[PDB]
């Protein structure tokens, strides 16, 4: 049936730039049928917020830097001067049909200057070790761009397949990311080895950074 095609599906742009997102009906629609296209903004963990309704009307309290326009079967959202708080996924919505439908979304990322991560390693707690399991955590804090590589070694043995990573959404004020890497080992394996190391590679680092601890030292 009728759908909206959104493009691009993602972009990055600098503070102060002009961004345009497009939404296109999937087929021909009889003339004079209104779609009353709306645009919403969604930040992490939050409900969508209304930006634009009926094609071009700015919703109350929305900054004037957002505008919408439409011609025929094509609608545009325009952010005239991109701000760090505008990191979000933007969705159009069409009301030709009942039910109405949403575009698939456009993820907007703020480009900023390179920032190297601060790196911390945390040993497992004595409390956890009682349970039979040890978690070793490596934190990369407040960096840009998002791409980073973490390598774990245990007494110089490269750990492969027993870690998981998590990355924060882009910060709405400083446009950075942070990342955790968690290595899981049995208590018995942990207690068999001494040197635990996380090595971080990232564009802001001229060489990889290694943080390590020796089990049973302080």
């Amino acid at each position: 049936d009728i759908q909206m095609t959104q493009s691009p599906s993602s972009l990055s742009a600098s503070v102060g730039d002009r961004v345009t997102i497009t939404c296109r009906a999937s087929q021909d629609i009889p003339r004079r049928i209104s779609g009353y296209v709306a645009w919403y903004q969604q930040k992490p963990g939050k409900a969508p917020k209304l930006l634009i309704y009926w094609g071009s009307y700015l919703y109350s309290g929305v900054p004037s830097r957002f505008s919408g326009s439409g011609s025929g079967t094509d609608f545009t959202l325009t952010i005239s001067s991109l701000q760090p708080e505008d990191f979000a996924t933007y969705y159009c919505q069409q009301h030709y049909t009942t039910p109405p439908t949403f575009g698939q979304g456009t993820k907007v990322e703020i480009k900023r200057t390179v920032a190297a991560p601060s790196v911390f390693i945390f040993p497992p707690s004595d409390e956890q070790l009682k349970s039979g399991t040890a978690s070793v955590v490596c934190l990369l804090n407040n960096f840009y761009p998002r791409e980073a590589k973490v390598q774990w070694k245990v007494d110089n043995a490269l750990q492969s397949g027993n870690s998981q990573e998590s990355v924060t959404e882009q910060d709405s004020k400083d446009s950075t990311y942070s990342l955790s890497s968690t290595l899981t080992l049995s208590k018995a394996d942990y207690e068999k080895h001494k040197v635990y190391a996380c090595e971080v590679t990232h564009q802001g680092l001229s060489s990889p950074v290694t943080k390590s601890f020796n089990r049973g030292e302080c």
Binding site: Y53, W54, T101, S118, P123, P124, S135, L139, T182
Partner: protein
Amino acid sequence: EVQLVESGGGLVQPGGSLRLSCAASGFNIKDTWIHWVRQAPGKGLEWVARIYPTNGYTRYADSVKGRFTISADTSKNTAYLQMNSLRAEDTAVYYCSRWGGFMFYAMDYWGQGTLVTVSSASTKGPSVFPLAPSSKSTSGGTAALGCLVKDYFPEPVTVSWNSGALTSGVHTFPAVLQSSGLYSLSSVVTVPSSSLGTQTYICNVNHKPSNTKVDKKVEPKS
């Protein structure tokens, strides 16, 4: 003070039933239209249903017809989504929203959402372990510490620090699903190397689905 608040979401077994509530304040649902919209984890928005409480007119997305019913009770200022014959694919955050004034086709106010998880797996609260600071672990000019909130199900958990007094420099990571089928996350915070062993840091963890609350003091190991 226009507000919508969803409740009733949570873990349910496949084929099970759940009733969501959307409680309105600051306006009367009798004066408008109420919608439900859902969002599967990491996916886009999907419209589910709408109702015009005054006359009971409802419409539904094909994906829920015959299983879900939208309804409303104007005396309670509350709308409902009764969901029967639930499936894994119905796992999502469910948002209620309205139209305002006579401004059709514009969802102006939304609830915060309620997560519905459709799974045979059972609820389990987390264990909370310290990620201890050390004066010998400084980077970028600060120390760091945190809480590892391990082995829970379903989502979500919330973490605050010092009962909400400490917000600067906090990162609570998105949960990751382990090979065990349980979630885990860490919440961390950067702080001054001078504050250690003198400032109290407490992470406040609440896993509502299991009624699990923990306050964990995190300090330098001795």
